[PDB]
């Protein structure tokens, strides 16, 4: 159970970059679940591309293609 590694201070820092001034005490457990749901949908696609190529090493391009398929084009990693 490594979800606890996303600490409360880190969530507050993310909220500050987003402009949030005051934060309620229940936001932390809601945010952990949202992030956990987001990661799984990207990793499943990356692993699918890795398996089609019969490789054993997940590669940056697999992630780039997984994100582009969802409409989240990322510039910078080739």
């Amino acid at each position: 159970d490594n979800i606890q590694g996303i600490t409360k201070p880190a969530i507050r820092r993310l909220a500050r970059r987003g402009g949030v001034k005051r934060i309620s005490g229940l936001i932390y457990e809601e945010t952990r679940g949202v992030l956990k749901v987001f990661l799984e949908n990207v990793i499943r696609d990356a692993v699918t591309y890795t398996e089609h190529a019969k490789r054993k090493t997940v590669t940056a391009m697999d992630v780039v293609y997984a994100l582009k398929r969802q409409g989240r084009t990322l510039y910078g990693f080739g």
Binding site: D45, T48, Y49, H52, A53, Y65, R69
Partner: protein, 93 residues
Amino acid sequence: SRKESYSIYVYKVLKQVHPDTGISSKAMGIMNSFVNDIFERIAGEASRLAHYNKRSTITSREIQTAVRLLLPGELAKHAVSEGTKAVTKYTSA
């Protein structure tokens, strides 16, 4: 000119699923659009999968992977079994 359509095949399937039921012309037009939609989506992903691996030929593995990427979990789970059974019987014939 002559226009092709899937109407006869959709009707054969309907007669297999519900012999007593019929279908109106508008419903047939909708079904005829749905089939072309999914056809173009699968052929598109199979094409992308081929270029990323420098392969020159589309094969059943490209179709199976495109199906696993496009359809939700249970639908993909069943469709893969249907395609595998069809290809196995065709090759054994």
